[PDB]
Design a protein around this ligand. Sequence first.
Ligand SMILES: Nc1ncnc2c1ncn2[C@@H]1O[C@H](COP(=O)(O)OP(=O)(O)NP(=O)(O)O)[C@@H](O)[C@H]1O
Ligand SMILES: Nc1ncnc2c1ncn2[C@@H]1O[C@H](COP(=O)(O)OP(=O)(O)NP(=O)(O)O)[C@@H](O)[C@H]1O
Ligand SMILES: Nc1ncnc2c1ncn2[C@@H]1O[C@H](COP(=O)(O)OP(=O)(O)NP(=O)(O)O)[C@@H](O)[C@H]1O
Ligand SMILES: Nc1ncnc2c1ncn2[C@@H]1O[C@H](COP(=O)(O)OP(=O)(O)O)[C@@H](O)[C@H]1O
Ligand SMILES: [Mg+2]
Ligand SMILES: [Mg+2]
Ligand SMILES: [Mg+2]
Lengths: 425, 473, 468, 469
Amino acid sequence: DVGTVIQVGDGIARAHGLDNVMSGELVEFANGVMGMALNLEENNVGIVILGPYTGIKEGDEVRRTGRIMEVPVGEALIGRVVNPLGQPVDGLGPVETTETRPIESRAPGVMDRRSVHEPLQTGIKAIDALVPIGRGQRELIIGDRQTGKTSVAIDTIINQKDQNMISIYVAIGQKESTVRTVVETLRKHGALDYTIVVTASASQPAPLLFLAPYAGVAMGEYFMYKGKHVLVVYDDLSKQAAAYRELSLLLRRPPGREAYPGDIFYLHSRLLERAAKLSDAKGGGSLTALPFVETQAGDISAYIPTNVISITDGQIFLQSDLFFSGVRPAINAGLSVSRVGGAAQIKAMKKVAGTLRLDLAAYRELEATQAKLARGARTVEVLKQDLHQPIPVEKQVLIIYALEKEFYLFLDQNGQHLLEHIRTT
Amino acid sequence: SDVGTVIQVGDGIARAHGLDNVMSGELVEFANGVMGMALNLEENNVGIVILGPYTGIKEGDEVRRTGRIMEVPVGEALIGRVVNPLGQPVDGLGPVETTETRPIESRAPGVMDRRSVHEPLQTGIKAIDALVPIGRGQRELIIGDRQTGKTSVAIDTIINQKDQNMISIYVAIGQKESTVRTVVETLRKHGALDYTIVVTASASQPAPLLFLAPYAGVAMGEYFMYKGKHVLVVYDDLSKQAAAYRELSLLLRRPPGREAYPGDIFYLHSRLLERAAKLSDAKGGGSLTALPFVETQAGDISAYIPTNVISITDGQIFLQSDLFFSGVRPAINAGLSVSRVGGAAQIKAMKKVAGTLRLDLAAYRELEAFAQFGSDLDKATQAKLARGARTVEVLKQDLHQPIPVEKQVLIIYALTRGFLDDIPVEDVRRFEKEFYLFLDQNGQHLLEHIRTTKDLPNEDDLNKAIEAFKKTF
Amino acid sequence: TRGRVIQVMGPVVDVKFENGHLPAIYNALKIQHKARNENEVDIDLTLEVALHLGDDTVRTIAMASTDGLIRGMEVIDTGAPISVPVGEVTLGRVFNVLGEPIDLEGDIPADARRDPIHRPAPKFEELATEVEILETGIKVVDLLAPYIKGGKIGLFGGAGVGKTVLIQELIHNIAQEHGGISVFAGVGERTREGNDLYHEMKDSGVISKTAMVFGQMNEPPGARMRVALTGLTMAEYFRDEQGQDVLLFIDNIFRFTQAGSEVSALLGRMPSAVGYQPTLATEMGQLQERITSTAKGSITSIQAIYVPADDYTDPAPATTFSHLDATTNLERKLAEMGIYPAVDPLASTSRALAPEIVGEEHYQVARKVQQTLQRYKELQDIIAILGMDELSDEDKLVVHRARRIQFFLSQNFHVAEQFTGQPGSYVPVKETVRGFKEILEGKYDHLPEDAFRLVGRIEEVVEKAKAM
Amino acid sequence: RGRVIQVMGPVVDVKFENGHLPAIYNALKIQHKARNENEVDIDLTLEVALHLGDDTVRTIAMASTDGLIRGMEVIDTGAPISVPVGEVTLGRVFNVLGEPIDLEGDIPADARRDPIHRPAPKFEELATEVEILETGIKVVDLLAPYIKGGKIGLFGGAGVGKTVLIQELIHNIAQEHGGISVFAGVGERTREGNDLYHEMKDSGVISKTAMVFGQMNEPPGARMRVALTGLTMAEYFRDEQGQDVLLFIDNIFRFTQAGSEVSALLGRMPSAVGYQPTLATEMGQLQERITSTAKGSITSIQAIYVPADDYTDPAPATTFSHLDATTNLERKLAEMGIYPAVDPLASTSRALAPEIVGEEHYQVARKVQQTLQRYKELQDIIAILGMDELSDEDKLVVHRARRIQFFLSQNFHVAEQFTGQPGSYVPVKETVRGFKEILEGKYDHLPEDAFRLVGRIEEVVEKAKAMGV
Ligand SMILES: Nc1ncnc2c1ncn2[C@@H]1O[C@H](COP(=O)(O)OP(=O)(O)NP(=O)(O)O)[C@@H](O)[C@H]1O
Ligand SMILES: Nc1ncnc2c1ncn2[C@@H]1O[C@H](COP(=O)(O)OP(=O)(O)NP(=O)(O)O)[C@@H](O)[C@H]1O
Ligand SMILES: Nc1ncnc2c1ncn2[C@@H]1O[C@H](COP(=O)(O)OP(=O)(O)NP(=O)(O)O)[C@@H](O)[C@H]1O
Ligand SMILES: Nc1ncnc2c1ncn2[C@@H]1O[C@H](COP(=O)(O)OP(=O)(O)O)[C@@H](O)[C@H]1O
Ligand SMILES: [Mg+2]
Ligand SMILES: [Mg+2]
Ligand SMILES: [Mg+2]
């Protein structure tokens, strides 16, 4: 059950003699570089390299591991930084695990899920009040360069500290320096006490960038099927789509609308459909997802953005008017819509702030009714936000209901007689 | 050498071995009786296009050459029926009793076998009948966006041919069967079925039937053309025929072209359309008038098939969505429409007024862009704008409401002579209604003179009739 | 007549039948293999034959994940296409592609009647053509493009414009109060949407007269290709063998075309325009022509069609436009403005909008509304360049009434509760026509335009105005 | 003798002996009598397009390929398509193959037949001798004069008037200059071909013209070689007869599209908007044989269809690089009654300079161009504001500009078919005299309709008298 490599290109090889290789298996190259068997033909087997392919040459033997595409998982991954194959990349030694999960596992059926019943308190005013996110939602963060998307993800993971929810950060194609900075930011805020980080930098081959979010989803699946709650962030799904386009074109597959393959929808779909809120019979676990998409010139009607919007349960459009317009993070509420809606919020928030989004959309339309315009500008200014500090919802609901840092200090410094009532309900 | 074994079956095509003596375009028969056309002939492989349900054909099944080019049965029995490209009826009205066949691929009449087209095909649509005249033997394309009035215009044309000996054929290609059935029933309600043949090639039919449908329709039309009768053939979309032929070529592994369309796609349309001709008295006066249809996506007439069909035809009627939604019915772009037959296909009375109408519309199209300032424009510009508004109200018509040629001539005469410059614009349609009744009450002599002499009557009597009606109005 | 797997790809598998007994096209094949040692994985997979090749070989499209497939694996031939269980058993149940229940309500009895999913469409002498207005209660739909009972309706939309919400309101307004039978087929939609709709159907007491088929985005291309055919078979038995009125909902019929395009290149077919299948139109027609009314019974079919990259000129929506009686076009620009259902008042047209079908008053008011909106759209450029004051008085009135109409064409949805906290509304066609006739007349000129958004009948507009 | 091995539509692959292969562009004949009742008689002509190796050539059909059977013998003629040339050619209608498609007999076998593929005349065989060719059309003779040996392109849309203008050029030149004319029906409409033949025959130009029709319903190879056939006839007439010879080509656009379709059928990768990669080479190989040499001259007039008013399309843009004079036919003028709908400002000529046409001619043409440009600029102001707002000079310039605008239109000898009015022929000297008189203010008192459709300014005076002025 060993073969000899007959071709090796830009991270894609073709081997000869792997008679019993299962589709999607794992194969070992002579120098210890992992690979995944993609296509099986009459005489040769197509392999995709998952690491440095420069050391692999024609004639090098390849062995069969006998295992499908899997990633290690367990409790030891908490606080660690690993590549898509689960091998640690930080200088903190190895990761000792016992269980493995398949990369391409089937999503839960239509009877295994339930409606989103509980909130995922991100800790940002507009996200937690205007575009609510639940514990089983797949909420897409979409925007141009800068625009503070990674900042939103970091604040989410930081605020999940008091919550009893595991968090996962998947870095696709991001600069390894930026990933290091984000990891150290999570360390300084204690977020690594519950967070796993999966990294696949730009210098890495396209297959690893393509494979990383599947590894993150499986890592979260281990905790969700165990009854725990997970939050998974893909640092850019656009870069994963580009990596998959490259990997497909190297395989001589004809392209589609924007040179992307035909699978470029399905590729994301079978990913974001593994994020679900399981029923009470299935243990009650959940896996929230926060895909990231980068838009060229803020054009959302492009191909990959519309694919991901078709797949996710809403979107948050962070428009570029942040660092030359202020009021960051600005929200294009006429487009940032949460499809789960008021079921995600608490009763108080749903009561107080159920009308903000329509008012904002109408105000943006009319800026193409003096009282309406005044109130709309007030609704724009009230949702101003601060730095990477989470803000709790309990003292923010009444601040929203007022229509305010002076209100923020006045509400709590005069006692918690208003705080505890909503902290309990 | 007359029998082979199919070695590949798939997706509406087949590849066979050993049909050594088969001709290009021949017919072949499979073990289950399903016909096929041997299109691609290669070194050790024959490409067959499947003319039926191909699910029953498996690899290794026998295939036998028939030594016969496709022939469509044709006769006077087909009139009033609905058939498929093979000529088999699709309604429950029993078999068609024809007794002669015509080859589906036949030569068009030569250069010397034709005659300059001179007798008008009266559409009944005032905009077409005036500004885009059509004559018997012409090839006129109707091109527009989806849901703009192509099929409605063709159906109104077929409706108008009741008392004109003007036999019609309607090739419904690519339309869903419910649409074709609705078309048939609405033709029947207005009595067109007494002189109409309908060829049906719906979407679920195998793509070669879609490809062959216009060939079958024109083959049926040529039979009546050669007997001195006048024939009208309407293809409800040549775009879908082009799509089906491209699908066949791509499956048959033929090199793509401009938009994956085959290299010979132009040929495929041209040799079809140029089969519509008007013959000289030596061959008989019988003629064939073609009305190909083309759908443009973003009003983009710059594509491959639209450009080809525009090049072939003797004129193009451009239907615009923005005109359809603005209340202009049937939304004919008289500014971008062309007719290379022109006055040769009009009554003399119609010509004398249509020239002035074209001049008026040309003047009006020069002042549309200034209408943004129209409140405070020049007196002459305002007069031209008012005349253009009255004209665009006059040219407005309703669905399934053909107008006789004499009344079209009279209303255009009233418009051009300036009798409508006093009435308000929104009333023009009502005018165009009531005046017509007025004619049928009193102006019967004028209509009879126009119908007999094919020329405008005495102008002072016409002016007196107009003045009398304006007093009545 | 066992076969052997020779090649394995993602969604397609090649099989070899060396005994010279090949399956027909669309025949079902079974991989049922148990791991003989620790280095294999037990597999239970269904394949659908698509093409024949030389030397006793067939190209098939697998119906589930192909991971774990090994060359040389044994193949069983079922001798027939995918037969789904049909009849009374389907009512109140949920099935996957293969007609196997997934609702945890028990296994369908083996001896139940099964029907193949591949059959030719009804012939010309069989279809029944007749236009009767189907009242949905949605103002813009029932006014500017009324739906036909027994016809075919298409909700064309981009990503996140309101296709699924509109489907839910059509189910809540139409399927609940209709005494026929209903079938919902989720083709390439979200599993969350399927589960939520299933719960909404059960707690409303309508699941008792409904069957469901679910093959979603998480499933391979073959599943998304054949979900529509399975649901069509289920509805077609009710239409033909029972003669009952049927309501067939398909939340994304575009995913069938998309999944056919995904496997197009691997099957061995040259790319067509925009990389679609060469046989896009034929494959779509072989499906859409089966969705039709017959002299045996009517089928009211509502399909939501996804528009890639918000481009209506894409080959799939363009080819689909010729298969539908009524068409609803959902616009992203209208959605961004808060106008829901974001129905394009101009580009959406239906065969039923005729003076003899909906009456003269309805036709007149609908055409006047469309003319006013088109005039406003054309005037928008002049307003942008010159301004508002430079417009004439007639153009100012046109802009006024056009803004009023465009706002008033929106209405609060029932399914919008969780998105708005506001109860839904049901507007009779008479109320819609009366309201728009009064708007055009100028009866409600003085009311601020804000009162016309997300409203029910015309009196609800003045009621909202009292709140200001 | 070869044998056909592959048939894919209008493309035929023929296998020959191991060493006796035909050359490229060589003509092959398939003449097969039906051996049984299951087949049909075949009379087909192919042109060797390229070589595949293994003693196989790929060829393009000039007739319908239906009915071909693999294995039937192919005759290798050993030379490209041969075409009858000379006296026998005159007054006849031929197809791409030189076979006369008229009913007036046929061509004898023992006659001189020239190949249609030949290298263009060399550098030292050329002759640059600029001389104006008088056509009789006022606007053309004034604002865009033609030259002997030049290539004059008539660009236009769908109904502008290119074919009627070609008809007048044929008729006027035949009746006045007595020159030999050749007509190449490239992608010719059988209806328009019939009309052209009838109007040639009725007016007596039949004896001064030889028509070559490549029918629109013919395979692309025929439609893209019929231009070369007409060029071969014209080149014989230039060389062996000496006097100037004119070559009119139906539409260059249809020749470029025939070439594009031929390339696509052969399987070559498309360029630009799907066009053939070798488009420039083919257009050059056509237009470079139309040159004036030491023996004689060939003037060429070619109509070019511009799709969707896209002048950046490869066919018109590539044609622009060979045309000494380009005339733009505008639909806007045609709808106004101005014929030949020649755009005065977009029409350019190589020979609109004093050194070729004289100081008076150039000055008059430039003054007319300036007046028309000023009127075009003043269009918006006269449309919005009244004519009173214009100054006296602006009033005068518009006053004269309308007169010139109508005066450039002339009654057509062929338009008697359409409008019945007899046509006219205007000498260049009288043309410039009339335009100079118009610009001098001698006729500012004549109403503009007098200049609507006439030949000479004296005819303008006569028409003004006719209306009762
Ligand atoms: N509310 C805020 N106030 C001030 N600065 C902010 C705020 N939110 C984000 N930033 C800054 O914005 C910058 C970009 O943040 P980041 O989240 O990395 O954007 P991004 O989505 O990652 N763009 P990219 O680098 O291409 O991934 C960082 O320097 C943040 O410190
Ligand atoms: N002259 C007219 N006046 C008013 N309404 C019209 C007119 N012509 C067509 N319509 C309407 O427009 C609709 C479109 O019909 P149709 O003529 O088939 O358009 P189309 O060009 O065929 N688009 P399609 O059939 O989908 O390719 C008809 O059903 C009528 O309701
Ligand atoms: N009447 C309405 N009132 C308020 N919001 C609405 C209304 N109709 C639709 N929406 C919003 O429209 C958004 C789009 O949701 P959805 O209906 O799923 O779009 P979609 O077309 O199904 N996306 P997809 O199916 O993946 O192509 C939702 O977030 C709703 O809140
Ligand atoms: N000189 C003219 N006088 C009157 N009518 C003309 C004249 N030239 C063209 N036309 C009209 O315009 C049409 C132009 O046709 P044609 O010139 O063949 O188109 P194209 O220029 O595209 O070849 C003719 O059918 C004729 O009716
Ligand atoms: Mg139509
Ligand atoms: Mg949806
Ligand atoms: Mg022409």
